[PDB]
Homo-oligomer: A and B are copies of this chain.
Amino acid sequence: MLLPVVARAAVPAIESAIAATPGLVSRIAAAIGSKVSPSAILAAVKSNPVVAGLTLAQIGSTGYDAYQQLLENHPEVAEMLKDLSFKADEIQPDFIGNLGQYREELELVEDAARFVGGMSNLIRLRQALELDIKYYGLKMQLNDMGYR
């Protein structure tokens, strides 16, 4: 059963997308593998949460809102839903070799990191040096007045 808190928002969201264009109705019917009739898929959404999710992946425009709210009230489907919906990210031909050149470089940062502290520190310390000189003067002067 789909939880009402979700379903309240979910059902009209889908129905709106259907009324927007018919072209999606055929798509979701293919992905979910349900009868092409708009009344059919809407009967399926209510029945299973897993199904409800795949529909909201097919339409991301208006539907993204409910989907997240579905995800909240159902941590269960979260794992299963993540698997059923997947697309291999196209990899660039240059990428893996292009990464090979930075081997020398990153090992240099991590030598500097360990010395300073956490990476957060080094990002700070780097700015402190890059920082304008006057500021060093400013801080010295406040200490001249007594301020710490």
Which residue of the partner chain B has the closest CB to A86? Answer: B127
Pick the contact of A109: B100, B117, B136, B145 (CB < 8 A): B136
CA distance A19 to B137 in the complex (A): 39
Interface-side segment among A4-12, A23-31, A51-59? A4-12
CA distance A12 to B85 in the complex (A): 21
Q: Please indicate the chain B residues that have their CB under 8 angstroms from the CB of A8 in the complex.
A: 64-65, 68-69
Pick the contact of A122: B109, B110, B128 (CB < 8 A): B128
Within 8 A of B (CB), among A92-143: 93, 95-97, 99-100, 102-103, 105-106, 108-113, 115-117, 119-129, 131-143
Cβ contact within 8 Å between B140 and A128:
no
Choose among A88, A117, A128, A135 the residue with the greatest number of B CB atoms under 10 Å from its CB: A128
Which residue of the partner chain B has the closest CB to A138? Answer: B96
Q: Please indicate the chain B residues that have their CB under 8 angstroms from the CB of A141 in the complex.
A: 96, 99-100
CA distance A96 to B93 in the complex (A): 49
**Minimum distance in angstroms from A94 CB to a CB of chain B:** 11
The chain A residues found within 8 Å of chain B, CB to CB, are 4-5, 7-8, 11-12, 64-65, 68-69, 71-72, 79-80, 83-84, 86, 88, 91, 93, 95-97, 99-100, 102-103, 105-106, 108-113, 115-117, 119-129, 131-143, 145
